[PDB]
Design a protein around this nucleic acid. Sequence first.
DNA 1: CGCGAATCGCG
DNA 2: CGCGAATCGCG
Lengths: 132, 132
Amino acid sequence: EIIWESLSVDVGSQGNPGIVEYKGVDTKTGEVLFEREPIPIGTNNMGEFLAIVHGLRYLKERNSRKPIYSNSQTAIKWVKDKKAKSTLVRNEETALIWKLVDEAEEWLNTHTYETPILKWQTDKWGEIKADY
Amino acid sequence: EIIWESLSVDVGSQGNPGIVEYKGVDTKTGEVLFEREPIPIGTNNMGEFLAIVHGLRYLKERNSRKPIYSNSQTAIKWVKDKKAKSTLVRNEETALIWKLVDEAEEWLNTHTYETPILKWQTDKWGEIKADY
DNA sequence: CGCGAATCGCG
DNA sequence: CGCGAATCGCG
């Protein structure tokens, strides 16, 4: 079952592709540990991929042993693969989200980390904490 | 139902990826109208994509009004899209099949053709004629 | 509404 | 055996 001493990372979109944001919350207290303000164009999967890698950087900085939960099979797999296999066109309007994704991949390719990245089982455990 | 005055195009593989060949046969008489000798490395889908575009070039040359049948949803869609969305790595060993695919796409991009490309319904009509 | 992973026919 | 199109959870 559930490690409550953990970080849950969630993405917020509505229109997909469209404005995307994300945050990292303490799984137990719901305390917001980091948040990214709205990016004008991205996809759910790119935003959740960024949320996971930001969570990794955040916990590594803090020397934390906590795991990360995500409800996204896709973003967990992209993090494992060190590759975000997004279909989002690369153009002037998507340049920011692609720059951030590209740089998150480079981070993954050049650092080690011990944080377990675990799948949040929404059908058994309810909504990921503080789900947008 | 079935237009018997037509061309059926089929691919032959075994190992996929692996040696690939294809041919075009008269749907009715089974007469072999063209055949490509074995290409040492390709995939089923790339071979069937080539078989369809070869069939188009063959019939156009002959001023023929005949349709082409294929049992491949994938190769029909790649021909429609004028793009073969193969995952086959581009390396020294796959250079020949990729050169042929690239040149078949260019053909599609630079010619018009009236040949209908129709899906062969194997579950109702049995095996595509002269199936390898 | 769209995004992508996980889940048939074909040789 | 693998190749790709057609066919769930998530916000």
